[model samples]
Target: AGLAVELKQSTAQAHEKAEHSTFMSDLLKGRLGVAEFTRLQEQAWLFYTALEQAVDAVRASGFAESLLDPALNRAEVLARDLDKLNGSSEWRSRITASPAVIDYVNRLEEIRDNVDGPALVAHHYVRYLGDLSGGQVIARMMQRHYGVDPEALGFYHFEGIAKLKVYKDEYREKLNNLELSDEQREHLLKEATDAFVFNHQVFADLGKGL
Candidate 1:
């Protein structure tokens, strides 16, 4: 099987844990407020910044560059969304990255610094694909549960991609076409699992605030 399918089958448990973790489940059930959602968007902004920068840094290396698509880049949309959510330009000063977030960024930093394309793709698949997938559901929950406006929720909207399902399938096809050895594939799977762990820890940290 290809890396895309392998990643799906292997990271299933981590994916489940990250989605059902305390903070996420609460937010999913509409038990959280705008402040809580904003906190997530804030943290997401940081994570996407690090991730997209890493992708750009490695693009010149000719590894994982095929996955590049303007529609999937989230940092800009996240920043704008936060501004709308907070009703001001000074939203960054109000929220601090949790310890888990720091650790998560540090992990991305390691991949970026090392120019590790295979490893970087693992993070990319974990993040952007998740955005295209489950992220949609959360965006709707924010509006339904917290009365968030569609204007303030641009992070989940992909204006450049018209068909999300077909886009995701095409993205996975690109992933499956990447060149890598069995050992490297194993390493990528591990990194993807770690990405989920990092995400779950961030949720745990966010839950502490509420």
Candidate 2:
């Protein structure tokens, strides 16, 4: 069953990566006005900051110590490199040309600052799965379609795909061993599902805009 779930996840991720790659290619090539480009970059930065905070909270919660270290490390690396990832100079220039991006950026920053603990932890767990599965596909797509190499995309590369299942199983084991009541378990599951849904919403919105 676990193997089946893993395979299904990989398949779904492949489709998602293909879709995202196409969308990004269109956005980059469309000569979207500075406003649109900066808006998109701001959105990416905001989403990632929230994600990093959630991952950090999960690590602090002591859910799976072994898995948490690598996860937090990856999140930190991504957070530190976000400006570079978004083509910072270009983004800044674009935003300067159109002040609307600044408003979005400020709003996103405010939301990121107020990220909830339990919600963040739950989101991190889902992202843990996403990083292991979809992340590889996204990295390859960026390299193939967007000419992004290892240095430019190091955040995706250093996620260490080999240990994904080991960590996933360990996480599941930890959750299983937790003394939470059924209600708590249900809530956690709902939170996890909501996280995935929220991420998908972002993608869908981008797709629609594209």
Candidate 3:
């Protein structure tokens, strides 16, 4: 639409389109009951475990020295939330990633194996940026309507980040700085779309779960 084919612009359309999905629509409208919301929490616990690990694996790859942000890791936050909402004893056993989740993590493994900076960047951009943006909104809604306490909602809070607008701009700048080939550009675009698709599938599965 714009004059630029920048990575930020290139990925924006798919990201925006996912907002229209039924699962997201439910959450936005506050229609998700406690069961559904908790289901999402469980799935997030699983995905972020895989996600944070993937971030580490990506950092070990080629041309990604500056990519790993410790603040972006979610395992501890997710674990605390799990304990808060679901409790600890049965919580460890009760929470499972579901078929959609295993599929999503498997996809991550495939992307990680490619050993390219841009390939991992596809997952990197979708997850961390999402937490900063829409994830915050979702956290607020869950807190307000669902009465979710701030203690368990560490996923939404950016403790390391003071200014999201400036940070987001800088993040895009880093994306632009990467020297991706035309083929790498193509790979990035596809994987980014696939990341969104994986999100849609997981949420959609939850939509049908309860």
Candidate 4:
């Protein structure tokens, strides 16, 4: 029952830091535009590919199946978005996964190799739930400030979920229902915090290029 509260409270600072990171600040302030967003999407494609693959690995073993919703998958969404952004070309080959993104993927791969269900759910919770939350706002800001068209903003749109609030509430309830040990819960809390740190480092890494 308290897992939601524990995760939220534990990761609040790290979450706030990610929201206020350098790349995010510049993007929101109009200093960065669709060009930067396109770059961000490229990294997101890599990030989500690793994450979804890891989720797939664990899900095959009956790990956190209820929490693993296909509707929240972003790898394909981002691929389609990237196609719209870059058109048919060698743009995929032109991009490189940043160091931060590489590290993030490595950590996820480690968890997958060891079949760490709680850790998998920890990353899953940080990403999809965060996307369902602030990601919609980011989508709007991208449109308002950068004039990005909806056609190219598919990453932020969730076609499967009708009511975001209700979905999120249900998600939290499911998270609370997961039967985890004290050590497992402790690991999940730390992993969630680490997920935000990974995101912050990604922003810091992206900021360097800007």
TM-scores, in order shown?
0.92, 0.59, 0.86, 0.93
For every candidate in turn, the CA RMSD to the true structure comes to 1.9, 6.9, 2.9, 1.9
Q: 95-158, model 3: which lDDT tens digit per residue?
A: 7677779998887776656555676777777788877777678888888877878777787787
> How close to the true structure is residue 173 of candidate 1, measured as C-alpha lDDT?
97
Off by over 4 Å in 3: 1-5, 8-21
**Evaluated with lDDT, which candidate comes out highest?**
4
lDDT of 3: 0.72
Instruction: State in Å the error of residue 54, model 2.
Output: 3.9
Candidate 2 structure, TM-score to reference: 0.59
lDDT of 2 by residue, 63-164 (tens): 434544553345345544445656554543442312323343343344346543334445556655556655566656555655655554555554544576
> Least accurate stretch of 10 residues (summed lDDT) in model 2?
95-104
lDDT (tens digit, per residue) of candidate 4 on 1-210: 489888888678676756345787889878888999999989999899989988988888897788888889899989888998888657777889889999999999998888898889889988888899887788889999999888889999898989999999999998889888999998998998998899888888898882
Per-residue lDDT, model 2, residue 149, is 52
lDDT of 2: 0.49
C-alpha positional error of residue 192 in candidate 3 after TM-score superposition, expressed in Å: 0.6
Error of 3 at 165 (Å): 1.1
How many steric clashes between backbone atoms does each model show? 0, 0, 0, 0
